[PDB]
Amino acid sequence: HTTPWTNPGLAENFMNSFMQGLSSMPGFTASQLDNMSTIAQSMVQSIQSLAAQGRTSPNKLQALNMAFASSMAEIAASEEGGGSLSTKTSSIASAMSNAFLQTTGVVNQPFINEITQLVSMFAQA
Amino acid sequence: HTTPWTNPGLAENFMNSFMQGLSSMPGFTASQLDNMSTIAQSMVQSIQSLAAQGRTSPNKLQALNMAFASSMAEIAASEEGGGSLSTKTSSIASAMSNAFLQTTGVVNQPFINEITQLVSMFAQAGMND
User: Does any domain span residue A3?
Assistant: no
User: Does any domain span residue A39?
Assistant: yes
User: Does any domain span residue A23?
Assistant: yes
* Cα gap B55→B33, rounded to integer Å: 30
- Supply the CATH number for residue B20's domain: 1.10.274.70
* Cα gap B14→A54, rounded to integer Å: 27
C-alpha distances out from residue B69 to A64, A100, B81, Å:
11, 24, 20
- Domain count for chain A, please give it: 1
User: Does any domain span residue B1?
Assistant: no
Contact B114 A108 (CB under 8 A): no
Q: Find the closest chain A residue to B34 by CA distance.
A: A60
C-alpha distances out from residue B113 to A3, A86, B73, B90, Å:
31, 24, 12, 11
Distance from CA of B73 to the nearest CA of A (A): 8
Q: Which amino acid is at A85?
A: L
From B50, B70, B79, residue closest to A66, measured CB to CB: B70
* Cα gap A22→A120, rounded to integer Å: 18
User: Does any domain span residue A2?
Assistant: no
Helix, strand, or coil here: A4? coil
Closest CA to A71 of A46, A107, A105: A46
- Report which DSSP code applies to B64: H
Q: Find the closest chain A residue to B65 by CA distance.
A: A71
User: Does any domain span residue B3?
Assistant: no
User: Does any domain span residue A1?
Assistant: no
Closest CA to A112 of A63, B72, B9, A95: A95
Give the rounded distance of the alpha carbon of A31 from its chain centre: 17
* Cα gap B9→B32, rounded to integer Å: 26
From B59, B114, B125, residue closest to A110, measured CB to CB: B125
* Cα gap B75→B96, rounded to integer Å: 15
Q: How many CB atoms lie within 10 A of CB B84?
A: 11
Contact B63 A110 (CB under 8 A): no
Q: Give the orientation angle of helix A58-78 with respect to helix B58-78, to 10 degrees.
A: 140
* Cα gap A122→A125, rounded to integer Å: 5
The alpha-carbon radius of gyration of chain A (Å, integer) is: 14
Domain range for A124 is 8-125
Burial zone of B105 (CB within 10 Å; 0-12 exposed, 13-18 middle, 19+ buried): exposed
User: Does any domain span residue A50?
Assistant: yes
**Alpha carbons within 13 A on the beta-carbon side of B11:** 27
* Cα gap B55→A109, rounded to integer Å: 33
Q: Which amino acid is at B20?
A: Q
